Amino acid sequence: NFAELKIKRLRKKFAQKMLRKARRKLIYEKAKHYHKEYRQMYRTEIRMARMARKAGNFYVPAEPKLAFVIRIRGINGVSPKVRKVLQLLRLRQIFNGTFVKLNKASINMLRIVEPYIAWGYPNLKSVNELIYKRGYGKINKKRIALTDNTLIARSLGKYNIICMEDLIHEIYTVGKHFKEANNFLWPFKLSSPRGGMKKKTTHFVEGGDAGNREDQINRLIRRMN
Template structure:
Protein backbone atom coordinates (compact mmCIF):
# COMPACT_ATOMS: atom_id res chain seq x y z
CA UNK A 1 0.00 0.00 0.00
CA UNK A 2 1.31 3.45 -0.85
CA UNK A 3 1.94 5.19 2.47
CA UNK A 4 0.40 8.65 2.78
CA UNK A 5 -1.68 10.53 5.35
CA UNK A 6 -4.95 8.86 4.30
CA UNK A 7 -3.60 5.29 4.40
CA UNK A 8 -1.89 5.91 7.76
CA UNK A 9 -5.21 6.99 9.28
CA UNK A 10 -6.92 3.92 7.78
CA UNK A 11 -4.18 1.70 9.20
CA UNK A 12 -4.65 3.30 12.63
CA UNK A 13 -8.37 2.41 12.52
CA UNK A 14 -7.67 -1.21 11.53
CA UNK A 15 -4.61 -1.48 13.81
CA UNK A 16 -6.17 -3.86 16.38
CA UNK A 17 -6.66 -6.43 13.62
CA UNK A 18 -3.52 -6.18 11.47
CA UNK A 19 0.27 -6.19 11.70
CA UNK A 20 2.03 -3.75 9.40
CA UNK A 21 5.44 -2.26 8.78
CA UNK A 22 8.12 -1.46 6.21
CA UNK A 23 9.43 -4.61 4.46
CA UNK A 24 12.97 -4.97 3.16
CA UNK A 25 13.86 -5.65 -0.47
CA UNK A 26 14.76 -9.24 0.43
CA UNK A 27 11.33 -9.84 1.98
CA UNK A 28 9.47 -8.32 -0.99
CA UNK A 29 11.56 -10.45 -3.36
CA UNK A 30 10.82 -13.68 -1.44
CA UNK A 31 7.14 -12.80 -1.20
CA UNK A 32 6.78 -12.21 -4.94
CA UNK A 33 8.85 -15.24 -5.96
CA UNK A 34 7.17 -17.68 -3.55
CA UNK A 35 3.61 -16.34 -3.34
CA UNK A 36 3.27 -14.14 -6.43
CA UNK A 37 0.54 -14.77 -9.00
CA UNK A 38 -0.72 -12.54 -11.78
CA UNK A 39 -4.28 -11.79 -12.87
CA UNK A 40 -5.26 -12.43 -16.45
CA UNK A 41 -8.90 -12.65 -17.57
CA UNK A 42 -10.02 -13.19 -13.96
CA UNK A 43 -7.70 -16.17 -13.57
CA UNK A 44 -4.77 -16.63 -11.21
CA UNK A 45 -1.61 -17.51 -13.12
CA UNK A 46 1.90 -18.12 -11.69
CA UNK A 47 4.65 -15.62 -12.45
CA UNK A 48 6.93 -18.21 -14.06
CA UNK A 49 7.23 -16.73 -17.54
CA UNK A 50 8.52 -13.22 -18.23
CA UNK A 51 6.78 -13.12 -21.62
CA UNK A 52 3.44 -13.33 -19.77
CA UNK A 53 4.42 -10.28 -17.70
CA UNK A 54 5.77 -8.45 -20.75
CA UNK A 55 2.56 -9.01 -22.72
CA UNK A 56 0.44 -7.47 -19.97
CA UNK A 57 2.71 -4.81 -18.43
CA UNK A 58 5.21 -4.28 -21.27
CA UNK A 59 3.68 -1.00 -22.38
CA UNK A 60 4.55 0.34 -18.91
CA UNK A 61 8.20 -0.81 -19.15
CA UNK A 62 7.66 -3.70 -16.71
CA UNK A 63 8.97 -6.79 -18.48
CA UNK A 64 10.07 -9.25 -15.77
CA UNK A 65 9.58 -10.31 -12.16
CA UNK A 66 12.53 -8.15 -11.06
CA UNK A 67 10.77 -5.08 -12.51
CA UNK A 68 7.64 -5.97 -10.52
CA UNK A 69 9.72 -6.26 -7.33
CA UNK A 70 11.42 -2.92 -8.08
CA UNK A 71 8.08 -1.14 -8.64
CA UNK A 72 6.62 -2.53 -5.41
CA UNK A 73 9.66 -1.78 -3.26
CA UNK A 74 10.32 1.73 -4.58
CA UNK A 75 6.62 2.63 -5.09
CA UNK A 76 7.53 3.74 -8.61
CA UNK A 77 5.40 5.42 -11.25
CA UNK A 78 3.87 2.06 -12.30
CA UNK A 79 3.04 0.97 -8.75
CA UNK A 80 -0.74 1.02 -9.23
CA UNK A 81 -0.85 -1.04 -12.47
CA UNK A 82 1.62 -3.57 -11.02
CA UNK A 83 -0.36 -4.04 -7.80
CA UNK A 84 -3.58 -4.35 -9.81
CA UNK A 85 -1.90 -7.04 -11.93
CA UNK A 86 -0.82 -9.08 -8.89
CA UNK A 87 -3.20 -11.49 -7.21
CA UNK A 88 -3.50 -10.86 -3.43
CA UNK A 89 -0.83 -12.77 -1.50
CA UNK A 90 -2.06 -15.74 0.53
CA UNK A 91 0.05 -16.17 3.65
CA UNK A 92 0.10 -18.96 6.22
CA UNK A 93 -0.02 -18.48 9.95
CA UNK A 94 3.50 -17.82 11.22
CA UNK A 95 5.54 -20.88 12.14
CA UNK A 96 5.55 -21.09 15.90
CA UNK A 97 2.14 -19.41 16.00
CA UNK A 98 1.10 -15.99 17.22
CA UNK A 99 2.52 -14.85 20.57
CA UNK A 100 -0.23 -12.59 21.89
CA UNK A 101 -2.63 -11.65 19.16
CA UNK A 102 -4.85 -9.65 21.51
CA UNK A 103 -2.24 -7.10 22.59
CA UNK A 104 -0.38 -4.39 20.70
CA UNK A 105 3.17 -4.97 19.43
CA UNK A 106 4.67 -2.37 21.77
CA UNK A 107 3.11 -4.28 24.69
CA UNK A 108 4.61 -7.61 23.60
CA UNK A 109 1.76 -8.63 21.30
CA UNK A 110 1.50 -9.16 17.58
CA UNK A 111 -0.71 -6.48 16.01
CA UNK A 112 0.12 -2.88 15.14
CA UNK A 113 3.04 -1.10 13.52
CA UNK A 114 6.13 -3.33 13.67
CA UNK A 115 8.22 -0.98 11.47
CA UNK A 116 11.24 -2.94 10.11
CA UNK A 117 10.51 -5.97 12.31
CA UNK A 118 7.66 -6.92 9.96
CA UNK A 119 10.34 -8.77 7.98
CA UNK A 120 10.75 -11.41 10.70
CA UNK A 121 7.00 -12.01 10.82
CA UNK A 122 6.64 -12.17 7.03
CA UNK A 123 9.51 -14.64 6.67
CA UNK A 124 7.75 -16.90 9.20
CA UNK A 125 4.52 -16.60 7.18
CA UNK A 126 5.93 -17.18 3.68
Protein backbone atom coordinates in the same frame (compact mmCIF):
# COMPACT_ATOMS: atom_id res chain seq x y z
CA ASN B 1 6.76 -23.35 -55.40
CA PHE B 2 7.47 -24.07 -51.64
CA ALA B 3 11.27 -23.57 -52.24
CA GLU B 4 10.42 -20.01 -50.96
CA LEU B 5 7.73 -21.08 -48.38
CA LYS B 6 10.09 -23.57 -46.56
CA ILE B 7 12.83 -20.83 -46.48
CA LYS B 8 10.26 -18.00 -45.72
CA ARG B 9 8.75 -19.93 -42.71
CA LEU B 10 12.35 -20.50 -41.34
CA ARG B 11 13.28 -16.74 -41.59
CA LYS B 12 10.10 -15.73 -39.61
CA LYS B 13 10.90 -18.58 -37.09
CA PHE B 14 14.52 -17.18 -36.96
CA ALA B 15 13.27 -13.52 -36.73
CA GLN B 16 11.19 -14.47 -33.59
CA LYS B 17 14.18 -16.39 -31.99
CA MET B 18 16.50 -13.30 -32.28
CA LEU B 19 13.45 -11.20 -31.10
CA ARG B 20 13.46 -13.37 -27.88
CA LYS B 21 17.32 -13.17 -27.45
CA ALA B 22 17.24 -9.31 -27.89
CA ARG B 23 14.47 -9.08 -25.19
CA ARG B 24 16.40 -11.68 -23.12
CA LYS B 25 19.64 -9.58 -22.97
CA LEU B 26 17.51 -6.47 -22.06
CA ILE B 27 15.92 -8.40 -19.08
CA TYR B 28 19.52 -9.32 -17.92
CA GLU B 29 20.97 -5.75 -18.30
CA LYS B 30 17.82 -4.17 -16.66
CA ALA B 31 18.36 -6.64 -13.71
CA LYS B 32 22.17 -5.84 -13.58
CA HIS B 33 21.24 -2.07 -13.65
CA TYR B 34 18.94 -2.74 -10.58
CA HIS B 35 21.81 -4.56 -8.70
CA LYS B 36 23.76 -1.23 -9.11
CA GLU B 37 20.65 0.81 -8.00
CA TYR B 38 20.03 -1.30 -4.80
CA ARG B 39 23.82 -1.09 -3.96
CA GLN B 40 23.74 2.74 -4.52
CA MET B 41 20.36 3.02 -2.61
CA TYR B 42 21.63 0.89 0.37
CA ARG B 43 25.09 2.61 0.59
CA THR B 44 23.90 6.29 0.31
CA GLU B 45 21.51 5.66 3.33
CA ILE B 46 24.60 4.63 5.46
CA ARG B 47 26.79 7.37 3.79
CA MET B 48 24.38 10.23 4.81
CA ALA B 49 24.24 8.83 8.42
CA ARG B 50 28.12 8.87 8.68
CA MET B 51 28.61 12.52 7.44
CA ALA B 52 25.84 13.45 10.00
CA ARG B 53 27.63 11.73 12.98
CA LYS B 54 31.07 13.11 11.80
CA ALA B 55 29.60 16.67 12.16
CA GLY B 56 27.64 15.44 15.26
CA ASN B 57 24.28 16.35 13.57
CA PHE B 58 21.44 13.78 13.00
CA TYR B 59 20.42 12.29 9.59
CA VAL B 60 16.66 11.43 9.84
CA PRO B 61 16.18 8.93 6.94
CA ALA B 62 13.11 9.31 4.61
CA GLU B 63 9.79 8.00 6.09
CA PRO B 64 9.22 4.68 4.25
CA LYS B 65 7.30 4.89 0.90
CA LEU B 66 6.23 1.18 1.10
CA ALA B 67 4.50 -1.06 3.74
CA PHE B 68 3.54 -4.79 3.71
CA VAL B 69 0.12 -5.21 5.48
CA ILE B 70 -0.68 -8.80 6.72
CA ARG B 71 -4.22 -9.55 8.08
CA ILE B 72 -3.90 -11.53 11.40
CA ARG B 73 -7.48 -11.59 12.93
CA GLY B 74 -10.43 -13.68 11.65
CA ILE B 75 -13.55 -12.94 9.51
CA ASN B 76 -16.10 -13.28 12.43
CA GLY B 77 -17.29 -10.28 14.54
CA VAL B 78 -15.79 -7.39 12.44
CA SER B 79 -17.21 -3.78 12.43
CA PRO B 80 -18.75 -2.63 9.06
CA LYS B 81 -16.27 0.29 8.52
CA VAL B 82 -13.40 -2.13 9.48
CA ARG B 83 -14.80 -4.75 6.98
CA LYS B 84 -14.79 -2.05 4.21
CA VAL B 85 -11.16 -0.83 4.80
CA LEU B 86 -9.76 -4.45 5.02
CA GLN B 87 -11.51 -5.30 1.65
CA LEU B 88 -10.20 -2.01 0.05
CA LEU B 89 -6.68 -3.20 1.18
CA ARG B 90 -7.68 -6.64 -0.37
CA LEU B 91 -7.33 -8.43 3.04
CA ARG B 92 -10.51 -10.61 2.80
CA GLN B 93 -8.92 -13.76 4.44
CA ILE B 94 -6.78 -14.36 7.63
CA PHE B 95 -2.97 -14.24 6.87
CA ASN B 96 -3.51 -12.48 3.49
CA GLY B 97 -0.73 -9.99 2.54
CA THR B 98 -0.61 -6.94 0.18
CA PHE B 99 1.92 -4.10 -0.43
CA VAL B 100 0.48 -0.66 0.62
CA LYS B 101 2.43 2.56 -0.25
CA LEU B 102 2.30 5.15 2.62
CA ASN B 103 0.80 8.67 2.31
CA LYS B 104 -1.65 10.66 4.58
CA ALA B 105 -4.71 8.94 2.92
CA SER B 106 -3.45 5.31 3.50
CA ILE B 107 -1.93 5.48 7.08
CA ASN B 108 -5.39 6.73 8.32
CA MET B 109 -6.84 3.57 6.58
CA LEU B 110 -4.06 1.44 8.28
CA ARG B 111 -4.77 3.00 11.79
CA ILE B 112 -8.59 2.30 11.50
CA VAL B 113 -7.93 -1.54 11.19
CA GLU B 114 -4.94 -1.68 13.68
CA PRO B 115 -6.37 -4.66 15.69
CA TYR B 116 -7.06 -6.73 12.48
CA ILE B 117 -3.68 -6.17 10.62
CA ALA B 118 0.07 -6.78 11.21
CA TRP B 119 1.81 -4.16 8.95
CA GLY B 120 5.32 -2.62 8.60
CA TYR B 121 8.12 -1.55 6.18
CA PRO B 122 9.39 -4.67 4.32
CA ASN B 123 13.05 -5.55 3.39
CA LEU B 124 14.38 -5.86 -0.23
CA LYS B 125 14.73 -9.69 0.33
CA SER B 126 11.21 -9.71 1.97
CA VAL B 127 9.92 -8.22 -1.38
CA ASN B 128 12.01 -10.88 -3.30
CA GLU B 129 10.54 -14.04 -1.57
CA LEU B 130 6.90 -12.67 -1.75
CA ILE B 131 7.11 -11.93 -5.57
CA TYR B 132 9.00 -15.18 -6.57
CA LYS B 133 7.33 -17.84 -4.28
CA ARG B 134 3.95 -16.22 -3.32
CA GLY B 135 3.83 -13.94 -6.45
CA TYR B 136 0.58 -14.65 -8.40
CA GLY B 137 -0.82 -12.46 -11.26
CA LYS B 138 -4.40 -11.08 -11.78
CA ILE B 139 -4.55 -11.97 -15.56
CA ASN B 140 -8.17 -11.98 -16.97
CA LYS B 141 -9.50 -11.93 -13.31
CA LYS B 142 -7.68 -15.31 -12.75
CA ARG B 143 -4.92 -15.98 -10.11
CA ILE B 144 -2.33 -17.28 -12.69
CA ALA B 145 1.11 -18.01 -11.07
CA LEU B 146 4.07 -15.78 -12.16
CA THR B 147 6.06 -18.74 -13.65
CA ASP B 148 7.33 -16.97 -16.88
CA ASN B 149 8.42 -13.36 -17.80
CA THR B 150 5.73 -13.24 -20.61
CA LEU B 151 2.87 -12.99 -17.97
CA ILE B 152 4.01 -9.64 -16.38
CA ALA B 153 5.12 -8.34 -19.86
CA ARG B 154 1.66 -9.42 -21.26
CA SER B 155 -0.19 -7.28 -18.59
CA LEU B 156 2.31 -4.57 -17.39
CA GLY B 157 4.47 -4.15 -20.58
CA LYS B 158 2.87 -0.71 -21.42
CA TYR B 159 4.36 0.64 -18.09
CA ASN B 160 7.75 -0.97 -19.14
CA ILE B 161 7.51 -3.78 -16.49
CA ILE B 162 8.58 -6.66 -18.84
CA CYS B 163 10.04 -9.16 -16.24
CA MET B 164 9.85 -10.20 -12.51
CA GLU B 165 12.82 -7.88 -11.56
CA ASP B 166 10.97 -4.80 -13.02
CA LEU B 167 7.90 -5.68 -10.81
CA ILE B 168 10.13 -6.14 -7.65
CA HIS B 169 11.72 -2.73 -8.60
CA GLU B 170 8.21 -1.16 -9.02
CA ILE B 171 7.08 -2.57 -5.58
CA TYR B 172 10.25 -1.85 -3.46
CA THR B 173 11.00 1.52 -5.23
CA VAL B 174 7.35 2.84 -5.21
CA GLY B 175 7.42 4.21 -8.82
CA LYS B 176 4.80 6.20 -10.84
CA HIS B 177 3.19 2.82 -11.92
CA PHE B 178 2.98 1.20 -8.40
CA LYS B 179 -0.89 1.08 -8.58
CA GLU B 180 -0.89 -0.95 -11.88
CA ALA B 181 1.91 -3.27 -10.50
CA ASN B 182 0.45 -3.78 -6.94
CA ASN B 183 -3.14 -4.36 -8.27
CA PHE B 184 -1.68 -6.87 -10.86
CA LEU B 185 -0.40 -8.99 -7.88
CA TRP B 186 -3.09 -11.23 -6.27
CA PRO B 187 -3.19 -10.68 -2.45
CA PHE B 188 -0.43 -13.03 -1.10
CA LYS B 189 -1.82 -16.28 0.45
CA LEU B 190 0.70 -16.54 3.40
CA SER B 191 0.68 -19.58 5.79
CA SER B 192 0.33 -19.30 9.64
CA PRO B 193 3.50 -17.95 11.38
CA ARG B 194 5.90 -20.96 11.87
CA GLY B 195 7.06 -20.63 15.54
CA GLY B 196 3.90 -18.98 16.98
CA MET B 197 2.39 -15.46 17.34
CA LYS B 198 3.08 -13.57 20.65
CA LYS B 199 -0.53 -12.31 21.27
CA LYS B 200 -2.97 -11.74 18.30
CA THR B 201 -5.45 -9.48 20.21
CA THR B 202 -3.14 -6.63 21.47
CA HIS B 203 -0.78 -4.08 19.73
CA PHE B 204 2.95 -4.99 19.14
CA VAL B 205 3.93 -2.19 21.66
CA GLU B 206 2.01 -4.05 24.47
CA GLY B 207 3.65 -7.47 23.67
CA GLY B 208 1.21 -8.34 20.82
CA ASP B 209 1.31 -8.57 16.97
CA ALA B 210 -1.59 -6.20 15.92
CA GLY B 211 -0.52 -3.16 13.80
CA ASN B 212 2.83 -1.44 13.02
CA ARG B 213 6.19 -3.39 12.95
CA GLU B 214 8.74 -1.10 11.26
CA ASP B 215 11.70 -3.48 10.44
CA GLN B 216 10.05 -6.32 12.50
CA ILE B 217 7.59 -7.42 9.69
CA ASN B 218 10.67 -9.08 8.01
CA ARG B 219 11.12 -11.44 11.06
CA LEU B 220 7.42 -12.52 10.52
CA ILE B 221 7.47 -12.58 6.61
CA ARG B 222 10.11 -15.44 6.72
CA ARG B 223 8.11 -16.95 9.67
CA MET B 224 5.03 -16.99 7.28
CA ASN B 225 6.66 -17.31 3.75
